[PDB]
């Protein structure tokens, strides 16, 4: 059965080529027995032993002899060596999708549309439907679950509860190609995701396809919760610094939210805390960056595990005193004070993780993503064609570096310099004018 | 087979178009329904590695599926039916259970 | 692998 | 905004007359035809690095997968010698980002020294590494894999 | 242009006029297949030139010669629509006409006795539908062109990789057109070689040895001579004064008693000039000055009768004393200089182990065949056959012209075989390119590269079929007797119809047509492959044939190419480039004598550019043709320079001829990067048509020819007046002067309604005129799929507004509000096909009965009594379509189930139904049902009803076709005979049948009346004959594959909306997955109240430089501003004068353009059409590389009343806020691609299985599973996981009992697993124990 003769559709057949090879060797053996019993002359039985030798050594390894090729097609046939000399072992409980963004869920719950979630958890649903008391057997369960009554979505939402799945992208490169999640059922046809984690897959959103598997047993579920869920890999295995740096839009929002203009509306007054700073921004009275003295209260744990307090009057903007309402008690005020680009926002997460632990870093990450999106929305930073100002010095500088090259050309035409030195003068002149 | 090859090659060129599988009978006196069988016999089988470039290099030999396994919701069905009739036959007397279990 | 035998002729 | 540099020609050394226009104004026909060759060269170059990295990870995995971290103490003393790297000029990677995380082997001591500063067999996290950076120790001794 | 572009005049920017209009874009395919089959009484492109190269065949003096006279094609027995419905090849018979004559005894040209002829059938040739698409098996196909190296000679430098010291070697190469190659090369030992094709290498002069050239004439032909004369006084020598140039001075020079050069000083041009001054002729040398020189002539002895010194000897003073002891005083020797004349043939003759012709022929015969014993006759036959006969070596006329070009002869017509003045010229040019004069060529210069499209490939396959027939007929002709045979027994029909049909059907170089757009057909019909039989394959390239080489300018487009695995290989043609006589690409130009400038175009090949200077199209001429700038940017040989205002001989035609077809339609291309312009030119070719395509607002202007030529619009053939429009047909009545003398009637167009295309898209047509409106030749009469009013239109324009909104457009996502999916702007229609077969099983055939076991009445409501679904039944996903039951025996039931079946009841006799059903997800509407059947089974009621309806439709169409045409015929007869002979009301009192009896006195229109009468008579005959043929074509059976009974088909017709995952993208380079579909209130309005529909991402512009889309957004906004101003002006009916003045001021617009049109020649009922059609925004246009500026966008912004900077203030819609920092709104165009989320979502829970190894694999219309390779096993072993890895490749995939043993545990309620053993390891033991090795599993 390893070398079958399975019938195709409608009379024609299909076979592996070992049938023709074994038929050749059996034929030539039988013929040599017939010729050796009748006592023929010697040249005939010598040719017989030689061509039987060729047949056996073409059956054991075809490719180091005359390459015995089949009739009716000029492709060379294969034998046992090329069934060991040789990508994938295909898997049940699979699926694939297109991905979208969905920035309203936390960093450990990807979505799942309903239909893949019903075509993947069908044995769990069959078992719990026949165990609850809404059915007689699995035949009645199969009759119930496919015409889609309205009392199977609750059983699906009770077996989804904390059962992990395993997202995965196709050209897997490094160790964070296989993370693990906990699904939230949702309408639609595309797998949702998170806008932070897509800095680690090297995955754009222009139509790249991910894959969902399912772990089945009990040791597998507990292992995929303890060792590889998506909130115990926030330290890249190459270096120290975390791989959850914000990527595209939220860094622009948190760059616009901590700056300092020279004169904005309502600049000069003195507030009484971060809550009244937020309430003076939302009342449409003072704008979002104007230098204004506020007070703060840091919290320090430089003692033997004890949180000591402090208070002062510091000199900041309204934007940083709005951003201060998110940082937990551990960090000092030397973090939210600067211009807050990208290196600073990697360093803020790094020092929070190296001081407090894991769960303040998780909650700090999700809160910083939500504030980044809300103020990138209410800023409205866009580009028009009247923002790329070409200088007022293009014509004169191009005129100077066009006159000097023509001077060097007429110096070469009179035979005072040579070709290589002229060619190394012109490159020098142009590559200075560029800078 | 060789006779139906030779008179097909001799018939194809003078009447013009193609041998229909019933007018090819009447040059002989065959019973008009054996020619389909003797034409279905006369074809050599397909080698199972003529490749098909389906976004990669693959073969005809792995797309050809299986016909003899039974689906697992038949084994689950019979595994339920075993305990079901064992339960419904545990309520009778000894004589009826013995006559049914050996009948 | 570095760093007259055909049965029709004979 | 400015001029877009100097684009190559297929032998490698560059054309003497560069493109003097930018994208907000109009690239005309000759400067566009010089730019398209460099664009096609770059985009065909970034389609072989993938297969080359795949081959390198293939060989470097098949030579080095048999290790498993299997005891809690080997019991030797020697190791390698750490120092801030110098590429003939100002420094490129200082001692703090090189010694961070690996277990010291012998005692670490000052010039006049008076005593031992850090103990013999301790792991170096940020408190001990700040203690190494403040008192300005030159070279630390440390245990490595190839000496195990 | 009478009423097409008098409707919706496209406003045109751009400042340079053009002389040459765009040619017919599909000229290549049509002219090549027009020359493949045509009657021309000579050779040159025909099938004539294929039959005159095998025929005549004469036997081996058997006195029976076969010859050929003529041939003739036939009529196709099916037209294209019925042939595509059925499935057969659109065919044509090819009936050649041979002739057999027999010669007689003892007479070469004796009078023959046997003259005969009989037409022999052979094969087919598939003809060509008139858009350029073959049809082979029900699917439209296109054959792509090819481009490979030219036959003829060229050399090659090949520096670098050999020996790493600068020791280069120039190898010539003679590549012929059919046969075997030929080589010449060098080596670091500097000795010439000779090499027949790729077998093994041999020393050089063996060909001249075996080809009857001895040593005397070869050393005569290569080198020169100089005279040594020992005239009985001490070694005199007559000397040529240039020979000293390169001669280091080695003796003292004096003659005629005049000293010239002292010894030790190299002789300079002064003393060479003195030698040419006084003509000094006789110089004395030292006696051993022939110490390295060799004499030329054979030298015999004086009286003794021996040999002293022949040619090619090491001439020394001992042999010189043997020489001049007899009286040899005139000696001729060779000339030698190491930098002028290298004698490499001398040393390779010194290492030559052959000396004569027979030994060289045995050497060649032993070389090119291994292990063989030689014979003189066989070696002579082989060497005189392989290089000179006209059946195994055919260097064609193209190679002849190139061979005469690259060796500086003059004549261009010659022989097809190479004689003995070509091998010596190749060796002469090789020696000269080694010594310095004349240098090397290269490849991909496009003067060494050609194009052969269809005709040459079909001719070559027809030739191979011809020689396979002719070998057999020559071998059978030998035993042929006098006359009992006719020439239709010996020549069969199978190999030709195997060869040409397999070549059109399944080769590498004939692929399916991407037919889902007007654009993608016309860019797939003209491509340039470089793969396939005869060129480099997919991995032999290297980065010197993939790259742009700058004679690619204007003949092959640079900025468009498929990307990924084979880049730089499948580039496409320019817009104006043509094909020359031989097959080299060639572009147009304009002749400038400086004249003023001349206006005659002049075509120009690949190499004739390389000696001229050529000016630039982007350089202004001023006022009837003078140049104005005193230095104009030009090019001479690939280099751009600055020349004078004279001496430039050629100027470029117009500024479009660098780009492709599908890449000259991206507007504002002059700003984008080449990378994203490449992505745009690859992403316009995948745009699925929508329900009602509109127009592009900022187009290009090269759109009209692209919509007209790739024929999907029924273009009018004779202009006139429309009679009767309908949803299906169109009747157009011709005028008087464009009419034939008879047969006038009316023209008639039938239109293709709903049909599937090749990619499951939906193609229909609609008429675009009204009753009583004139047309002209070249107008449109039918819009296509994605066509509107003659122009090409793919997507729908809608209001983008760049602002990053709440994170829902994070990386590249878009955000479409619900106004789009409510107003149905992107709704598309698909047409699926579902078949089901009815085979012949062993235990009994299968029926189509509509009574199935194991179902009730819930599914069988939508079935009729015969068993196939209705027309109209809107079926969901999972209902019955065609009931099909199969018989089955050998039941073999069980225990306790048979105990159960001994109580209630039982069924039998018709088991598992393989009746097809609609695959899951579809929600169709079954529009058509077709039933084929095999001849010899009495069909049921549904087939008979289908046949009756088709018969009624055919009779109806032919009756109305002869009912409306004779109406115009009778109106023509009456309107003719009333002129000159009018009767008052005698027209309408006697009937039409007794109307044609009233004749006339002798006039031309009397003969016209008689001609029209006989035309009506012959139409009356042909109607009945055509209906007889039509019913015979309908009522018969069909042919089928062996083992079927009847196929029943259905055509579903889905309608698809736009859901989170349909990939949308603009034109020039910004893809996006659509992300969330918002309600209408939440979108950010502006101050007037209009919402805005799509919110892109403004972080994608300064990273990948495509600055063009911001500027396109501004200009589109200005066009819609002018549109809504004219809409507010027309909403109250005021006048026509305000519209006249306002539209004239809209069309004038400042700077000097070429678009002065309004205000005089237009009527009053034309402005009310043009202002009816411009309320949705005035179109703008832009030539590509000469586009708009900034001031013109500012002007057309100010002609409305909008803010001029471009950016408006834009409120929010959730909180009533104002956005600070105002943002950019506008109007860009958007396609809708086909990578749909209902074509990629997939799942699998438990399905089918394979056979040889039991992996999962779905083949019952269920998905498989995503394969688990080895990079994911490393990325899962890198963790601590091993339970999940053991589970994912031992239980879920490849175990035979373990997976059922686990499925029962899951369905009962105890999660666990058992390991087992995998099937790949359990099959590797048998496939390794079937060798002689042993392998076991020993210990406990
Ligand atoms: Mg991508
Ligand atoms: Zn150790």
The 3-state secondary structure of E284-311 reads: ECCHHHHCCCCECCCEECCCCCCEEECC
Residue A170: nearest ligand to its CA? 1
User: Among residues E542, E1051, E473, which one has the least CA distance to residue E754?
Assistant: E1051
Strand E253-255 relative to strand E258-261, pairing: antiparallel
In a domain, E1326, yes or no: yes
CB pairs under 8 A between A and D: 31
Q: Is E528 helix (H, G, I), strand (E, B) or coil?
A: strand
The Cα E1014–Cα E10 span in angstroms is 49
- Please count the other Cβ atoms lying within 10 Å of the Cβ belonging to residue E300: 14
Mutation site for B-interface testing, chosen from E1257, E1309, E1323 by largest number of B Cβ within 10 Å: E1257
In a domain, E1248, yes or no: no
- Does E1153 lie in the same domain as E1221? yes
- Kindly state the DSSP code that residue D71 receives in the 8-state scheme: -
Of A12, A139, A142, the CB nearest to B46: A12
In chain E, residues with a C-beta closer than 8 Å to the C-beta of B14 are 488
Instruction: Give the residue on D whose Cα is nearest the Cα of A423.
Output: D16
Exposure pattern of D38-49 as b/e (b: 16+ CB <10 Å)?
bbbbebbeeeee
The Cα A236–Cα A201 span in angstroms is 12
Q: Is E826 helix (H, G, I), strand (E, B) or coil?
A: coil
Cβ proximity of E868 and E942 under 8 Å: yes
Cβ proximity of E372 and E378 under 8 Å: no
Domain C-terminal end among E301, E322, E341 = E341
- Does E346 lie in the same domain as E219? yes
What residue has token string 């320090």?
A300
- Method by which this entry was solved: cryo-EM
Q: What distance in angstroms lies between residue E1274's CA and the mean position of ligand 2's atoms? A: 26
- Does E1309 lie in the same domain as E1333? yes
Q: At E854, list the tokens.
A: 């194991």
- Does E145 lie in the same domain as E64? yes
Resolution at which this structure was determined, Å:
4.1
Of B43, B49, B77, the CB nearest to A138: B77
Q: How far is A391 from chain D (nearest CA, A)?
A: 8
User: Among residues E787, E879, E885, E786, which one has the least CA distance to residue E834?
Assistant: E879
The Cα E603–Cα E613 span in angstroms is 15
The Cα E1073–Cα A101 span in angstroms is 9
What residue has token string 């222009």?
A206
Residue numbers of B between 26 and 65 with CB closer than 8 Å to A: 40, 43-50, 60-61, 64
Instruction: Give the residue on B whose Cα is nearest the Cα of A19.
Output: B47
Is D61 close to E675, i.e. CB distance below 8 A? Answer: no
Cβ proximity of E195 and E206 under 8 Å: no
The Cα E882–Cα E842 span in angstroms is 22
Q: Is E836 helix (H, G, I), strand (E, B) or coil?
A: strand
| CATH code of the domain in which E859 resides | 2.40.50.150
In a domain, E355, yes or no: yes
| CATH code of the domain in which E993 resides | 6.10.140.1670
Cβ proximity of E641 and E1043 under 8 Å: no
Q: At E1303, list the tokens.
A: 């499925």
The Cα A375–Cα A381 span in angstroms is 10
- Does E428 lie in the same domain as E383? yes
Split into its structural domains, chain E has a count of 9
Q: At A6, list the tokens.
A: 């399975």
Mutation site for A-interface testing, chosen from E1245, E1247, E1332 by largest number of A Cβ within 10 Å: E1245
Cα–Cα distances in Å, from E1007 out to E898, E992, E1042?
93, 19, 59
> Which run of H or of E encompasses E119?
strand E116-124
Helix axes D29-45, E674-683, angle to 10 degrees: 80
The Cα E570–Cα E530 span in angstroms is 7
Cβ proximity of E186 and E170 under 8 Å: yes
By the CB < 8 Å criterion, does A237 face chain C?
A: no
What residue has token string 């389609």?
D47
List of chains touching A (3+ CB pairs within 8 A): B, C, D, E
User: Among residues E1174, E1200, E1234, which one has the least CA distance to residue E695?
Assistant: E1174
Residues in contact with E716: Cβ distance below 8 Å, sequence separation at least 6, in sequence order:
E732, E775, E776, E777, E778, E779, E781
First to last CA, chain E: 94
The Cα E582–Cα E152 span in angstroms is 13
In chain B, residues with a C-beta closer than 8 Å to the C-beta of A12 are 43, 45-46
Q: What distance in angstroms lies between residue E1071's CA and the mean position of ligand 1's atoms? A: 9
Question: Taken in order A190, A191, A192, A198, is the CA torsion positive or negative?
Answer: negative
Is D2 close to A385, i.e. CB distance below 8 A? Answer: no
User: Among residues A15, E1038, E740, which one has the least CA distance to residue B48?
Assistant: A15
CB pairs under 8 A between A and E: 299
Residue A201: nearest ligand to its CA? 1
Strand E640-643 relative to strand E601-604, pairing: unpaired
> Which run of H or of E encompasses A349?
helix A343-355
In chain E, residues with a C-beta closer than 8 Å to the C-beta of B56 are none
Of B43, B49, B77, the CB nearest to A139: B77
- Does E878 lie in the same domain as E750? no
Q: Backbone breaks in chain C (C–N > 2.5 Å) follow which residues? A: 3
| CATH code of the domain in which E622 resides | 2.30.150.10
The Cα D52–Cα E633 span in angstroms is 44
- Does E1020 lie in the same domain as E1141? no
Residues in contact with A287: Cβ distance below 8 Å, sequence separation at least 6, in sequence order:
A261, A264, A265, A266, A318, E1220
- Does E1079 lie in the same domain as E1197? yes
Tell me, yes or no, whether chains E and A touch by having 3 or more C-beta pairs under 8 A.
yes
In a domain, E716, yes or no: yes
The Cα E808–Cα E805 span in angstroms is 7
In a domain, E215, yes or no: yes
In a domain, E6, yes or no: no
In a domain, E808, yes or no: yes
As beta bridge partners, residue E152 has: E175
First to last CA, chain D: 58
Is E1042 close to B78, i.e. CB distance below 8 A? Answer: no
Q: Binding site annotation covers A206?
A: yes
Q: Binding site annotation covers A387?
A: no
Instruction: Give the residue on A whose Cα is nearest the Cα of D97.
Output: A240
Q: What distance in angstroms lies between residue E539's CA and the mean position of ligand 1's atoms? A: 25
Domain C-terminal end among E341, E364, E398 = E341
Domain C-terminal end among E279, E312, E341 = E341
In chain D, residues with a C-beta closer than 8 Å to the C-beta of A354 are 126
List of chains touching E (3+ CB pairs within 8 A): A, B, D
In chain D, residues with a C-beta closer than 8 Å to the C-beta of A396 are none
Q: At E505, list the tokens.
A: 């059907």
The Cα E125–Cα A303 span in angstroms is 95
In a domain, E15, yes or no: no
Q: Tell which phi-psi region holds residue A273, choosing left (phi > 0), alpha (psi between -120 and 50) or beta.
A: left
Helix axes E1137-1148, E1164-1173, angle to 10 degrees: 60
By the CB < 8 Å criterion, does A409 face chain E?
A: no
Q: Binding site annotation covers A20?
A: no
Q: How far is A317 from chain B (nearest CA, A)?
A: 58
Residues in contact with E270: Cβ distance below 8 Å, sequence separation at least 6, in sequence order:
none
Domain interval for residue E252: 224-341
Q: What distance in angstroms lies between residue A97's CA and the mean position of ligand 1's atoms? A: 14
By the CB < 8 Å criterion, does D88 face chain A?
A: no
Of B9, B65, B85, the CB nearest to E899: B85
Q: At E533, list the tokens.
A: 């039989």
- Does E1031 lie in the same domain as E954? yes
- Does E1047 lie in the same domain as E914? yes
- Does E816 lie in the same domain as E676? yes
Q: How far is B91 from chain A (nearest CA, A)?
A: 20
Long-range contacts of E100-108 (CB under 8 A, 24+ apart): E100/E64, E100/E66, E100/E486, E100/E487, E101/E64, E101/E65, E101/E66, E101/E67, E102/E63, E102/E64, E102/E65, E102/E482, E102/E483, E103/E63, E103/E64, E103/E65, E104/E63, E105/E63
Cβ proximity of E453 and E146 under 8 Å: yes
Q: At E1003, list the tokens.
A: 């006039």
Is E1251 close to B100, i.e. CB distance below 8 A? Answer: no
Q: How far is D62 from chain A (nearest CA, A)?
A: 16
What residue has token string 């550019």?
E609
Of E558, E671, E1274, the CB nearest to D36: E558
> Which run of H or of E encompasses E255?
strand E253-255
Q: Is E350 helix (H, G, I), strand (E, B) or coil?
A: helix
- Does E1186 lie in the same domain as E1288? no
Instruction: Give the residue on A whose Cα is nearest the Cα of E1263.
Output: A95
Q: Is E268 helix (H, G, I), strand (E, B) or coil?
A: coil
């Amino acid at each position: 059965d390893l070398r079958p003769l399975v019938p195709l559709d409608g009379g024609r057949f299909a076979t592996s080529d070992l049938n023709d090879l074994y038929r050749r060797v059996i034929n030539r053996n039988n013929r040599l027995k017939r010729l050796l019993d009748l006592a023929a002359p010697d040249i005939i039985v010598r040719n017989e032993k030689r061509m039987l030798q060729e047949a056996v050594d073409a059956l054991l390894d075809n490719g180091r002899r005359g390459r015995a090729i089949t009739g009716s097609n000029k492709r060379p046939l294969k034998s046992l060596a090329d069934m060991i000399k040789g990508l994938g072992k295909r898997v049940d409980y699979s699926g694939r999708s297109v991905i979208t963004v969905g920035p309203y869920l936390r960093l450990h719950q990807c979505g799942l549309p309903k239909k893949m979630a019903l075509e993947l958890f069908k044995p769990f649903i069959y078992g719990k439907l026949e165990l609850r008391g809404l059915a007689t057997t699995i035949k009645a369960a199969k009759k119930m679950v496919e015409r889609e009554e309205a009392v199977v979505w609750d059983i699906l939402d009770e077996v989804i509860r904390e059962h992990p799945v395993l997202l995965n992208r196709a050209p897997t490169l490094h160790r964070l190609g296989i993370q693990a999640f906990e699904p939230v059922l949702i309408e639609g046809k595309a797998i949702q995701l998170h806008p932070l984690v897509c800095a680690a897959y090297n995955a754009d959103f222009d139509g790249d396809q991910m894959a969902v598997h399912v772990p089945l047993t009990l040791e597998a579920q507990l292992e995929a919760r303890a060792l590889m869920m998506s909130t115990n890999n926030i330290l890249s295995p190459a270096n120290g610094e975390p791989i959850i740096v914000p990527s595209q839009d939220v860094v622009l929002g948190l760059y616009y939210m901590t700056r300092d203009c020279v004169n904005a509306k309502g600049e000069g007054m003195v507030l009484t805390g971060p809550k009244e700073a937020e309430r003076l921004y939302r009342s449409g009275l003072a704008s979002l960056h104007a230098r204004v003295k506020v007070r703060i209260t840091e919290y320090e744990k430089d003692a033997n595990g004890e949180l000591v307090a402090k208070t002062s009057l510091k000199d900041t903007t309204v934007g940083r005193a709005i951003l201060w309402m998110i940082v937990p008690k551990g960090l000092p005020y030397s973090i939210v004070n600067q211009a807050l680009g990208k290196k600073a926002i990697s360093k803020m997460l790094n020092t929070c993780y190296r001081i407090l632990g894991l769960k303040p870093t998780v909650i700090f990450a999700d809160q910083i993503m939500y504030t980044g999106f809300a103020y990138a929305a209410r800023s409205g930073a866009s580009v028009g064609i009247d923002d790329m100002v070409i200088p007022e010095k293009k014509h004169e500088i191009i005129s100077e570096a066009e006159a000097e090259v023509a001077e060097i050309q007429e110096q070469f035409q009179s035979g005072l310099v040579t070709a290589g030195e002229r060619y190394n003068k012109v490159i020098d002149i142009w590559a200075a004018a560029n800078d | 087979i060789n006779k139906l090859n030779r008179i097909s090659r001799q018939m194809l060129q003078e009447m013009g178009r193609e041998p229909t599988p019933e007018e090819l009978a009447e040059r002989m006196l065959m019973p008009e329904d054996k020619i389909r069988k003797v034409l279905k016999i006369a074809k050599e089988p397909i080698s199972m590695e003529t490749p098909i470039g389906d976004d990669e290099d693959s073969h005809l030999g792995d797309f050809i599926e299986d016909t003899t396994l039974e689906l697992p919701l038949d084994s689950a069905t019979t595994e339920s039916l075993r305990a079901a009739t064992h339960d419904v036959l545990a309520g009778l007397t000894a004589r009826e259970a013995k006559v049914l279990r050996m009948r | 692998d570095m760093g007259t035998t055909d049965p029709v002729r004979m | 905004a400015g001029m877009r540099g100097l684009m190559a020609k297929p032998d490698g050394s560059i054309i003497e007359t560069p493109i003097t226009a930018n994208f907000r104004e109009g690239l005309n026909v000759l400067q566009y035809f010089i730019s398209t060759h460099g664009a096609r060269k770059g985009l065909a170059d970034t389609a072989l690095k993938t297969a080359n990295s795949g081959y390198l990870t293939r060989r470097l995995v098949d030579v080095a997968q048999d290790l498993v971290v299997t005891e809690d103490d080997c019991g030797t003393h020697e190791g390698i010698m750490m120092t801030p790297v110098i590429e003939g000029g100002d420094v490129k990677e200082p001692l703090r980002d090189r010694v961070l995380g690996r277990v010291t082997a012998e005692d670490v001591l000052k010039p006049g020294t008076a005593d031992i500063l850090v103990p013999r067999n301790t792991l170096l996290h940020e408190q001990w590494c700040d203690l190494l950076e403040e008192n300005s120790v030159d070279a630390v001794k440390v245990r490595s894999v190839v000496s195990c | 242009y009478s009423y097409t572009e008098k409707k919706r005049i496209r406003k045109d920017f751009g400042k340079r006029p053009q002389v040459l209009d765009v040619p017919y874009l599909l000229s290549i395919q049509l002219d090549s297949f027009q020359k493949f089959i045509e009657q021309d009484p000579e050779g040159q492109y025909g099938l004539e030139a294929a039959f005159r190269s095998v025929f005549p065949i004469q036997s081996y003096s058997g006195n029976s010669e076969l010859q050929y006279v003529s041939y003739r094609l036939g009529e196709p027995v099916f037209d294209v629509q019925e042939c595509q419905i059925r499935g057969v090849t659109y065919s044509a018979p090819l009936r050649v006409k041979l002739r057999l004559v027999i010669y007689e005894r003892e007479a070469p040209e004796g009078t023959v006795k046997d003259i005969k002829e009989q037409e022999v059938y052979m094969g087919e040739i598939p003809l060509m539908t008139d858009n350029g698409t073959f049809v082979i098996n029900g699917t439209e196909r296109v054959i792509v062109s090819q481009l490979h190296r030219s036959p003829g000679v060229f050399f090659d430098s090949d520096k670098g990789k050999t020996h790493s010291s600068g020791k280069v070697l120039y190898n010539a190469r003679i590549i012929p057109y059919r046969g075997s190659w030929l080589d010449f090369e060098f080596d670091p030992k500097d000795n010439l070689f000779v090499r027949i094709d790729r077998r093994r290498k041999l020393p050089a002069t063996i060909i001249l040895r075996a080809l009857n050239y001895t040593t005397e004439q070869i050393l005569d032909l290569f080198f020169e001579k100089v005279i040594f004369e020992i005239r009985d006084n001490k070694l005199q020598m007559e000397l040529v004064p240039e020979r000293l140039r390169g001669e280091t001075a080695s003796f003292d020079i004096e003659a005629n008693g005049k000293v010239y050069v002292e010894k030790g000083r190299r002789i300079t041009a002064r003393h060479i000039r003195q030698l040419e001054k006084d003509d000094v002729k006789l110089i004395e040398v030292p006696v051993e000055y022939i110490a390295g020189k060799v004499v030329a002539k054979d030298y015999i002895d004086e009286s003794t009768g021996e040999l002293i010194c022949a040619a090619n000897m090491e001439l020394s003073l001992d042999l010189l004393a043997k020489l001049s002891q007899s009286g040899h005083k005139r000696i001729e020797t060779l000339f030698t200089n190491d930098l002028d004349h290298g004698p490499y043939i001398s040393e390779t003759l010194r290492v030559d182990p052959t000396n004569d012709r027979l030994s060289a022929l045995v050497e060649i015969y032993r070389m090119m065949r291994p292990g063989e014993p030689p014979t003189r006759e066989a070696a002579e036959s082989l060497f005189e056959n392989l290089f000179f006969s006209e059946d195994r070596y055919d260097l064609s006329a193209v190679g002849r012209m190139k061979f005469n070009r690259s060796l500086l002869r003059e004549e261009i017509e010659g022989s097809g075989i190479l004689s003995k003045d070509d091998i010596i010229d190749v060796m002469k040019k090789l020696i000269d390119i080694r010594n310095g004069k004349g240098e090397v060529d290269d490849i991909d210069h496009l003067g060494n590269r050609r194009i052969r499209s269809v005709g040459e490939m079909a001719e070559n396959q027809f030739r191979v079929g011809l020689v396979r027939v002719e070998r057999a007929v020559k071998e059978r002709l030998s035993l042929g007797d006098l006359d009992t045979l006719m020439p239709q027994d010996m020549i069969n029909a199978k190999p030709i119809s195997a060869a040409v049909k397999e070549f059109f059907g399944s080769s590498q170089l004939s692929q399916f047509m991407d037919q889902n757009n007007p654009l993608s057909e016309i860019t797939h019909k003209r491509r340039i492959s470089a793969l396939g039989p005869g060129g480099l394959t997919r991995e032999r390239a290297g980065f010197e044939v993939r790259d742009v080489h700058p004679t690619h300018y204007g003949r092959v487009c640079p900025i468009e190419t498929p990307e990924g695995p084979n880049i730089g290989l499948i580039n496409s043609l320019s817009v104006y480039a043509q094909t020359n006589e031989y097959g080299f690409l060639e572009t147009p130009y304009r002749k400038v004598t400086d004249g003023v400038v001349t206006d005659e175009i002049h075509y120009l090949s690949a190499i004739e550019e390389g000696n001229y200077v050529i000016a630039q199209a982007n350089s202004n001429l001023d006022e009837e043709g003078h140049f104005v700038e005193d230095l104009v940017t030009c090019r001479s040989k690939g280099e751009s320079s600055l020349f004078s205002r004279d001496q430039v001989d050629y100027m470029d035609v117009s500024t479009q001829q660098v780009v492709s077809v599908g890449a000259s339609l991206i507007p504002f291309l002059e700003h984008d990067d080449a990378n994203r312009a490449l992505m745009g030119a690859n992403m316009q070719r995948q745009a699925v048509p929508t329900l009602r395509a509109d127009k592009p607002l900022v187009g290009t202007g090269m759109e009209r020819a692209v919509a007209v030529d790739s024929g999907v619009t029924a273009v009018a053939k004779r202009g006139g007046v429309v009679q009767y429009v309908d949803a299906s047909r169109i009747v157009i009545k011709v005028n008087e002067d464009e009419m034939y003398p008879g047969e006038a009637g009316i023209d008639i167009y039938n239109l293709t309604k709903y049909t599937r295309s090749n990619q499951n898209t939906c193609i229909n047509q609609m008429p675009c005129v009204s009753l009583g409106e004139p047309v002209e030749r070249g107008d449109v009469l039918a819009d296509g799929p994605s066509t509107d009013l003659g122009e090409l239109a793919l997507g729908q324009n809608m209001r983008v507004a760049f602002m990053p909104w709440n994170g829902y457009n994070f990386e590249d996502s878009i955000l479409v509000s619900e106004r789009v999916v409510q107003e149905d702007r992107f709704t598309t229609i698909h047409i699926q096909e579902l078949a089901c077969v009815s085979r012949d099983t062993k235990l009994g055939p299968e029926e189509i009965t509509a009574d199935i076991p194991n179902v009730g009445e819930a599914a069988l409501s939508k079935l009729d009594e015969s068993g196939i679904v209705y027309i109209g039944a809107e079926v969901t996903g999972g209902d019955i379509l065609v009931g099909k039951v199969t018989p089955k025996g050998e039941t073999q039931l069980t225990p306790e189930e048979k105990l159960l079946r001994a109580i209630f009841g039982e069924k039998a006799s018709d088991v598992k139904d393989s009746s097809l059903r609609v695959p899951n997800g579809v929600s169709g509407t079954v529009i058509d049902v077709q039933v084929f059947t095999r001849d010899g089974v009495e069909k049921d009621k549904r087939a008979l009803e289908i046949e009756e309806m088709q018969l009624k439709q055919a009779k109806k169409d032919l009756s109305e076709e002869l009912q409306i045409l004779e109406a115009g015929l009778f109106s023509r007869i009456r309107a003719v005979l009333v002129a000159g002979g009018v009767e008052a009301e005698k027209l309408d009192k006697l009937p039409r049948d007794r109307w044609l009896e009233l004749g006339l006195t002798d006039e031309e229109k009397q003969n016209q009346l008689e001609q029209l009468a006989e035309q009506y008579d012959e139409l009356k005959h042909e109607f009945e004959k055509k209906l007889e043929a039509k019913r015979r074509k309908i009522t018969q059976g069909d042919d089928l594959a062996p083992g079927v009974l009847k196929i029943v088909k259905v055509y579903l017709a889905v309608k698809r909306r736009i859901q989170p995952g349909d990939k949308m993208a603009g034109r020039h380079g910004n893809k996006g997955v659509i992300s969330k579909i918002n309600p209408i209130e939440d979108m950010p309005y502006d101050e007037n109240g209009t919402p805005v529909d799509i919110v892109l991402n403004p972080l994608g512009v300064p990273s990948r430089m495509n600055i063009g889309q911001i500027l396109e957004t501004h200009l589109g906004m200005a066009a819609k501003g002018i549109g809504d101003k004219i809409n507010a002006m027309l909403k109250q009916q005021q006048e026509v004068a305000k519209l006249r003045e306002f539209i004239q001021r809209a069309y004038d617009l400042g700077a000097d353009v070429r678009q002065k049109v309004d205000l005089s020649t237009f009527s009053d009922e034309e402005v009310m059409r043009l202002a009816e059609n411009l309320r949705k925004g005035m179109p703008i246009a832009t030539p590509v590389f000469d586009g708009a500026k900034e001031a013109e966008i500012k002007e057309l912004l100010k002609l409305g009343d909008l803010p001029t900077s471009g950016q408006i203030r834009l409120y929010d819609g959730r909180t009533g806020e104002q956005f600070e920092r105002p943002v950019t709104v506008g109007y860009m165009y958007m396609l809708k691609l086909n990578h749909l989320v209902d074509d990629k979502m997939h799942a699998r829970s438990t399905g089918s299985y394979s056979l040889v190894t039991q992996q999962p694999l779905g083949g019952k219309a269920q998905f498989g599973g995503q394969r688990f390779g080895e990079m994911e096993v490393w990325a899962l072993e890198a963790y601590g996981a091993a339970y999940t890895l053991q589970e994912m490749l031992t239980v879920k995939s490849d175990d035979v009992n373990g997976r059922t043993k686990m499925y029962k545990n899951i369905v009962d309620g105890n999660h666990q697993m058992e390991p087992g053993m995998p099937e790949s390891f359990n099959v590797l033991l048998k496939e390794i124990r079937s060798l002689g090795i042993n392998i076991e599993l020993e210990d406990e």
